[PDB]
Amino acid sequence: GGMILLIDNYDSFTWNLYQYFCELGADVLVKRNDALTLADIDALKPQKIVISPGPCTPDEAGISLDVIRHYAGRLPILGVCLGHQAMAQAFGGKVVRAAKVMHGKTSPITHNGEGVFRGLANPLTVTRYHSLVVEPDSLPACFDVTAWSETREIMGIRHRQWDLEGVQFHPESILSEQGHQLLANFLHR
Amino acid sequence: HMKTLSPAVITLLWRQDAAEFYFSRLSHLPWAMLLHSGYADHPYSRFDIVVAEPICTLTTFGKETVVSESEKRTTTTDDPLQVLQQVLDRADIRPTHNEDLPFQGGALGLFGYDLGRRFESLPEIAEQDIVLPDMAVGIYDWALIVDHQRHTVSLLSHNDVNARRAWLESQQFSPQEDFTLTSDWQSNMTREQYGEKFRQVQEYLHSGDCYQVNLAQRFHATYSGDEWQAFLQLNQANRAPFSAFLRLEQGAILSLSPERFILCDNSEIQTRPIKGTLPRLPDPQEDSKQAVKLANSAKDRAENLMIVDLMRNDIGRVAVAGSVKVPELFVVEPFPAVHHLVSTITAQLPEQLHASDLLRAAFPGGSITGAPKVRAMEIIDELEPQRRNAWCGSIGYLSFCGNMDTSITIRTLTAINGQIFCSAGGGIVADSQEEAEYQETFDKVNRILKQLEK
Ligand SMILES: N[C@@H](Cc1c[nH]c2ccccc12)C(=O)O
Ligand SMILES: [Cl-]
Ligand SMILES: [Cl-]
Ligand SMILES: [Cl-]
Ligand SMILES: [Cl-]
Ligand SMILES: [Mg+2]
Ligand SMILES: [Zn+2]
């Protein structure tokens, strides 16, 4: 029995994520990255937090980084695309150009059946809208990689101790398989 | 409000052509409007709607809406769809839904593409060379409904349906001088100039500004004679289920649109984005093959799903809770000129919203702008020489009962002070190819353009 806070980082498909979560029975509060402070979050008392995709860098994602630093190990956090990159960067990871431009291409990803991939089919076909990946050689030791592209780019990370996980792709997208079961893992873990 | 009672209905004599027969005599009256299902065999081709003689009109040019009643005329800078909803509410006609009578009176007319500039801040690079409203909507307290499923012709009115029957039967039809084109068709761009714009768009897709852009060209010719005779012959040939003839104060809109923008039927929302087209082929064996090539083309399925993701988001902003579903993907719909790839998104309108609020959230269509929508529109304004005006807007109705249906005004001509305009576009992705997409525009309107050449 808990509200989910979706931090909107001004993506074009933010309501697709809100609707997917609503389809799964979740009470979602949508607040924008510049419309919330960490103190405001404490009083809203969320049970879980999702950092939405966005066109900006983690630095320009308002309170996104601030939220990860403060709530890591206190509340479950999911990061999607930008939210995933912000998650990596907050622990000392770097973001880099992808291999090629990935504008609504789908791609098969292999995974280890851990975190949000618990119970899901392997491989999984998913869509990427954005052209930046987490740098593997830089990835902090506190994260396992949960999924890889055909190219061995990072498509998911999970913290080894705390409930906080990131996916590079768009599960909310109709082009992406088992988006519902993926987000249901996060919701009901 | 004051009138919750259902409108009085009179059934007239069934004939398949009832709408063209009754509308002939009204075709010359400003604010006379026909929505025609093109006589199409199509799951969304059932109703022809005829209105005229509105109790109230709304005209939007730029930041001003003029609302004209009998003698009263007001001007306002307010949101045009908020003004429209206020006028509907102020009419104090509130009937229950009737599945057989989807428009029970209310608003009907044109929402032009450049009405979108009232909902988003956009650059002003493209040249405004057609003076015709961004919104031209009449309020009607009556209608004539032709139902091709029940084979019924219904005349409804919230005033005196008997007087309206007589008023209608009393009007008579002196066929006007026949339509002729008095010049050849001429594009607003050379094939060279298309390229320069096609390359500039792909340059913008590589930067990852946007993922998709509908790039359009416009053909113009001079004409003389009655636009209604042109429409009768185009309507026959195009069999398009979202066809319309609007007589405006400034000119006529001849819509042969096959595309539905948004339907709101007893709070059940539906949108059917067209994205993906292959031309139709002479040999009936080779043409059945095109329908499978189109359905099974990975490039074309990708482009479509991008637009489904866009429409899911536009509708999802305002839809109820977890109501946004995608019940059907990549159905191929054959039309005389072209096969089209059509996907359908459904949702529920919350009781706190109106169909007008739904229309504001989604307008203009993702299917004819691109993704992200605002950047696609920025680029379109930057590269297309002239504003789109009535083309790639919407024609449709907002019933007093709460229902709505709208088109996208593709395959739509504007006829104004002796000039006739026809536009054709096509979705551009990084993968797509200059000559294919240039030729795609021609394939979309050639039968239209050539049918009018004599
Ligand atoms: N085809 C629609 C009615 C319709 C015809 N042409 C239109 C143009 C715009 C909006 C609706 C329409 C139906 O059966 O209900
Ligand atoms: Cl198209
Ligand atoms: Cl299939
Ligand atoms: Cl579904
Ligand atoms: Cl077109
Ligand atoms: Mg195409
Ligand atoms: Zn992304």
Numbering used by the authors:
A (entry chain AAA): -1 to 187
B (entry chain DDD): 0 to 453
Sentences from the paper on this structure:
GATs comprise minimally a glutaminase that produces ammonia, which reacts with a synthase-bound substrate to yield specific nitrogen-containing products. As evidenced by analytical gel filtration and isothermal titration calorimetry (ITC) data, the PabA and PabB subunits form a heterodimeric assembly with a dissociation constant KD = 0.16 ± 0.06 μM.
Interestingly, in the ADCS structure without any reaction ligands bound to the glutaminase active site, we observed a metal ion with tetrahedrally coordinated interactions to the two PabA catalytic triad residues aC79 and aH168 as well as to aH128 next to the PabA active site, as evidenced by an anomalous electron density map. As the coordination geometry of this site did not match any of the ions added during ADCS purification or crystallization (Na+, K+, and Mg2+), we searched for alternative metal ions by X-ray fluorescence (XRF) analysis. The resulting data allowed assigning the bound metal ion as Zn2+ that fits well with the predicted coordination geometry. As Zn2+ was not added at any stage during purification and crystallization, the most plausible explanation for its presence is its extraction from the expression host. Comparison of the glutaminase active site geometry in the presence and absence of Zn2+ allowed to identify conformational changes associated with Zn2+ binding. While we did not detect any significant positional changes for the catalytic triad residues aC79, aH168, and aE170, the side chain of aH128 flips from an orientation blocking the PabA active site in the presence of Zn2+ to a conformation, in which it integrates into an interaction network forming the glutaminase active site in a catalytically competent conformation, in the absence of Zn2+. However, our biochemical data did not reveal any effect of Zn2+ on ADCS activity. The associated changes are most visibly illustrated by a long-range movement of residue bE119 from the PabB subunit, which is 10−13 Å from any PabA residues in different ADCS structures devoid of Gln-TE in the glutaminase active site. In all ADCS structures, we found a structurally conserved Trp molecule bound to each PabB synthase subunit, in agreement with previous structural data of closely related synthase subunits or domains of ADCS and anthranilate synthase (AS).
